[PDB]
Amino acid sequence: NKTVVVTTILESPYVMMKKNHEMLEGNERYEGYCVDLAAEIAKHCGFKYKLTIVGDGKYGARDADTKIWNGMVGELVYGKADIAIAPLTITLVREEVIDFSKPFMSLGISIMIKKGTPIESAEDLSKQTEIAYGTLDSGSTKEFFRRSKIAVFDKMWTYMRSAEPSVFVRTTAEGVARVRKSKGKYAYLLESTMNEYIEQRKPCDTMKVGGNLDSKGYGIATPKGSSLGNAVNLAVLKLNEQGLLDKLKNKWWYDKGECG
Amino acid sequence: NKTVVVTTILESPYVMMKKNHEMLEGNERYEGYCVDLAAEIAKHCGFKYKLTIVGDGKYGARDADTKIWNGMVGELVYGKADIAIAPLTITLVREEVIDFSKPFMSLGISIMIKKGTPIESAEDLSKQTEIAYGTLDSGSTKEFFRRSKIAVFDKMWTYMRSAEPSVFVRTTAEGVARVRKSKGKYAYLLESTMNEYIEQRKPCDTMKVGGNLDSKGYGIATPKGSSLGNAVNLAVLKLNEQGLLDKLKNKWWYDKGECG
Ligand SMILES: COc1ccc(C(=O)N2CCCC2=O)cc1
Ligand SMILES: N[C@@H](Cn1cc(F)c(=O)[nH]c1=O)C(=O)O
Ligand SMILES: N[C@@H](Cn1cc(F)c(=O)[nH]c1=O)C(=O)O
């Protein structure tokens, strides 16, 4: 057996640097839902591991011209990492190049607004131009709008793709900051899981509105043909059935909520 | 290529006999969410199929003594069917003997009450004895309580396993009938999906209360090593991403709701 190289991404509250990470080493430098999940998965599958933060800080997309995969998906595809344990959305294009465990968490694209913003749905956003809106610059959310044939979402994509200044952001933190500093003139489309987390964070000035636009899940990913695939999948199912995944979500989302 | 034998189960609104099934033949005799799903899956995977109703009318469990698997899982395990397209819950014990596609529908165990029943949660049920409660006699819901280490659910299991007369029912329809005819003295624990469907059916006298006890999903199942596994999994992801699964749920659950 060899130490398993785990690729993941800095995204709250999945993986975050501990306040005093400078005084720590190895896996101890990080904390979060996926850090806890990695420990449980490794324990149940019987392997030693090393957490690493994805080099380019991306989730995973294929360049239409070079055909090269970036982000965590890329690290798995090219063998730079053995497994990805992060909020990586299970999608068809990814399932074609890597393997996914059954989902360990549910989510859907949602709307985040600065409290008081006169928006209640995606339809509302699409029917007005006063309030700008966008998504994470790369990832499954952006692709959802790019590919959607649903009238409302296609109308939103047409606006976002040519809006200026750009409505796309590099990170969730940037999207949240933009919502918080735009006096209600910017709304952010992001995964419900991140939205729900931020809503319970000071200064408690954001809120999730409307229902989710879709329904999907995050899965643990391995390179196709990996000897870890089967065990990891069974571990996810066992952890869900034992109520551990629900326990972990409450721990990182609500137990220490900062908004009452 | 050979005609694919699909095993499924009579469970509303997944698979139901058309009103005039007697005048129809083959797959045309049935209608429902899973009937529509089977057609879409077959279309995308390029295969011809024959719908069959599981012989013993069960979902799938292993006898602790004979080690024999019954229900739809059994039909796959022993090669009597090539694929199962029904509301079959993805569980660890099943994943060990058959393969599951990524989930095509989300669900969680929930509580169904006759309107007016003074119950709002599982905790409420566990802390009283006036109102009896049970689950489907066999399936993942019963197993959830049998295996749960969570205090409230373990307390509920202890009561249900020895309650008399028996609180377990043979079919969902029987559980619903019992709730409807027990004047509020019986509450039924069942999958949220079925609960949500029944709530919009006349005589509109039942309702879902409290949050779900767990979070999981239904998956399409194939015998381990099946040449259909990969294609079927990709088909499920494609159908979800195209919004077809959401369209199908609205079609069979809400579009024709009977309660306003
Ligand atoms: C936590 O349990 C689950 C998380 C995610 C999923 C899932 O992948 N999907 C896809 C379409 C609807 C749905 O729920 C199913 C169950
Ligand atoms: N999970 C996504 C990445 N990702 C993350 C977010 F927080 C969000 O709002 N949108 C998104 O696409 C993926 O796997 O690409
Ligand atoms: N989906 C389950 C079967 N099943 C169905 C129900 F409607 C219910 O309430 N409980 C249950 O276990 C399985 O796969 O065993």
Side-chain angles (χ1 to χ4, degrees), chain A residues 90-93 95-96 100-103 106 144 150 213-216 233-234 237-238 240-241 243 246, chain B residues 90-93 95-96 100-103 106 144 150 213-216 233-234 237-238 240-241 243 246:
Chain A
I90 297 170
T91 66
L92 175 56
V93 292
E95 188 72 282
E96 288 175 347
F100 277 110
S101 70
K102 288 298 186 299
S106 63
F144 173 85
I150 298 183
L213 290 59
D214 62 3
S215 183
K216 53 201 176 187
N233 181 62
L234 299 182
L237 297 178
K238 174 172 286 186
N240 191 32
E241 282 168 32
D246 294 318
Chain B
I90 297 170
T91 66
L92 175 56
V93 292
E95 188 72 282
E96 288 175 347
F100 278 110
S101 70
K102 287 299 186 299
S106 64
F144 172 85
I150 298 182
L213 290 59
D214 61 3
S215 184
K216 53 202 176 186
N233 181 62
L234 299 183
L237 297 177
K238 174 172 286 187
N240 191 32
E241 282 168 32
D246 293 319

Side-chain angles (χ1 to χ4, degrees), chain A residues 92 95-96, chain B residues 40-47 83 101-102 220 222 226-239:
Chain A
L92 175 56
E95 188 72 282
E96 288 175 347
Chain B
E40 291 292 333
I41 292 294
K43 176 178 59 184
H44 284 280
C45 295
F47 66 72
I83 187 169
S101 70
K102 287 299 186 299
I220 299 302
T222 47
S226 167
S227 69
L228 299 179
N230 184 61
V232 167
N233 181 62
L234 299 183
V236 170
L237 297 177
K238 174 172 286 187
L239 294 173

Side-chain angles (χ1 to χ4, degrees), chain A residues 4-18 20-47 49-148 150-169 171-180 182-227:
Chain A
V4 177
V5 176
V6 181
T7 181
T8 191
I9 190 165
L10 291 173
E11 181 79 69
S12 301
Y14 306 94
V15 180
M16 311 173 280
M17 303 303 294
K18 286 180 180 172
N20 67 318
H21 64 277
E22 191 60 58
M23 301 187 91
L24 307 173
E25 50 189 55
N27 300 341
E28 293 297 309
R29 294 168 292 172
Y30 315 104
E31 65 176 356
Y33 177 104
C34 287
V35 174
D36 284 350
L37 181 57
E40 291 292 333
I41 292 294
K43 176 178 60 184
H44 284 280
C45 294
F47 66 72
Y49 63 103
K50 172 173 62 64
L51 297 174
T52 66
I53 301 307
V54 62
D56 66 4
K58 304 289 188 57
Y59 283 84
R62 193 186 71 169
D63 186 288
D65 302 304
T66 63
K67 303 173 181 179
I68 299 176
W69 283 90
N70 65 26
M72 292 181 278
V73 173
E75 300 206 328
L76 293 179
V77 169
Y78 301 112
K80 307 300 181 178
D82 301 308
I83 187 169
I85 300 179
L88 186 65
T89 306
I90 297 170
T91 66
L92 175 56
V93 292
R94 290 173 178 166
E95 188 72 282
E96 288 175 347
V97 302
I98 55 177
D99 290 332
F100 277 110
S101 70
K102 288 298 186 299
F104 63 79
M105 189 179 287
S106 63
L107 69 314
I109 292 168
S110 64
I111 301 174
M112 171 187 286
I113 56 167
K114 172 79 170 185
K115 289 182 175 185
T117 298
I119 292 293
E120 301 183 65
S121 65
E123 176 178 294
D124 282 357
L125 286 173
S126 75
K127 292 184 172 186
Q128 61 81 60
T129 173
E130 177 78 321
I131 303 165
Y133 51 94
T135 73
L136 186 62
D137 201 340
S138 61
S140 59
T141 299
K142 188 178 184 182
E143 287 308 306
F144 173 85
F145 286 102
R146 182 200 304 292
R147 306 303 180 184
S148 187
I150 298 183
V152 170
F153 310 150
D154 194 18
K155 186 177 181 182
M156 289 167 73
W157 172 244
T158 299
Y159 151 74
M160 298 189 290
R161 71 186 308 180
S162 62
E164 55 172 30
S166 178
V167 293
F168 301 111
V169 298
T171 65
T172 298
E174 189 179 313
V176 175
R178 193 165 171 177
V179 167
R180 288 177 166 157
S182 296
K183 303 184 178 183
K185 300 304 178 186
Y186 182 78
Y188 189 50
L189 288 154
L190 75 171
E191 298 182 326
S192 60
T193 39
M194 283 70 165
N195 199 350
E196 289 166 339
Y197 164 71
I198 298 295
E199 188 173 308
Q200 302 311 315
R201 299 291 295 178
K202 290 180 180 181
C204 313
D205 60 346
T206 68
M207 81 172 277
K208 176 181 175 181
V209 294
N212 294 346
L213 290 59
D214 62 3
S215 183
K216 53 201 176 187
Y218 297 142
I220 300 301
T222 47
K224 273 195 288 182
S226 167
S227 69

